[PDB]
Amino acid sequence: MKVGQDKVVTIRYTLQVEGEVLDQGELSYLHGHRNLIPGLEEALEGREEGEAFQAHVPAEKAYGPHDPEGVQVVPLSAFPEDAEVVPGAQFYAQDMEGNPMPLTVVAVEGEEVTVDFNHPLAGKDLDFQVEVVKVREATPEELLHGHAHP
Amino acid sequence: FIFGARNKVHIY
Ligand SMILES: [Cl-]
Ligand SMILES: [Cl-]
Ligand code: NA
């Protein structure tokens, strides 16, 4: 059976970004319901059960481009005093209205900290090695929920 | 944000 709309597909995968492995594992998903990033589902569309392949997914079809407006300067005094504020450090944050805005520290210059509110994979292309383990039809309940059962 | 980040973010 081929991967297509409304099929429940099991894959094994490895994810690399710029030659470094970030994740690997096995999962099942209902295809065609935005359950995985769009470029990965595009790469899976039409594959036969058993097929192994490579997929280079551009940033636009993964976590999106890097928005320059996500890079902002905040005061050092805003950070918790017991924290290490150094390049690469990640922190949970919110705006004044309580909207989540997690950040990564880019640089510290005196009492000014440059941070980045973009997702860490924004602007990055993703490289996948994938094996299609199994393809089957969805149950009516899976179709109703739009997700493969756990 | 343009000029407002320095006043408008709480960090936890
Ligand atoms: Cl995904
Ligand atoms: Cl800075
Ligand atoms: Na799914």
Residue numbers in the entry:
A (entry chain A): 1 to 150
B (entry chain B): 30 to 41
Reproduce, without paraphrasing, sentences from the article in which this PDB structure was first reported.
To study the length dependency, we used variants of the S2 peptide extended or truncated with up to eight residues. Extension of the peptide had minor to moderate effects on the affinity for the IF domain (up to threefold higher) and the FKBP domain (up to threefold lower). A peptide is bound to the IF domain in four structures: TtSlyDFL:S2, TtSlyDFL:S2-W23A, TtSlyDFL:S2-plus, and TtSlyDFL:T1. The binding site consists of a highly hydrophobic groove comprising V74, F79, F91, L103, V115, and F117, as well as the edge of the β8–β9 hairpin. Interestingly, although the binding mode is variable, three aspects are shared for all structures: (i) the peptides bind to the β8–β9 hairpin through β-strand augmentation with two to four hydrogen bonds, (ii) the peptides generally insert two hydrophobic side chains into the binding groove as detailed above, and (iii) peptide binding does not perturb the hydrophobic groove.
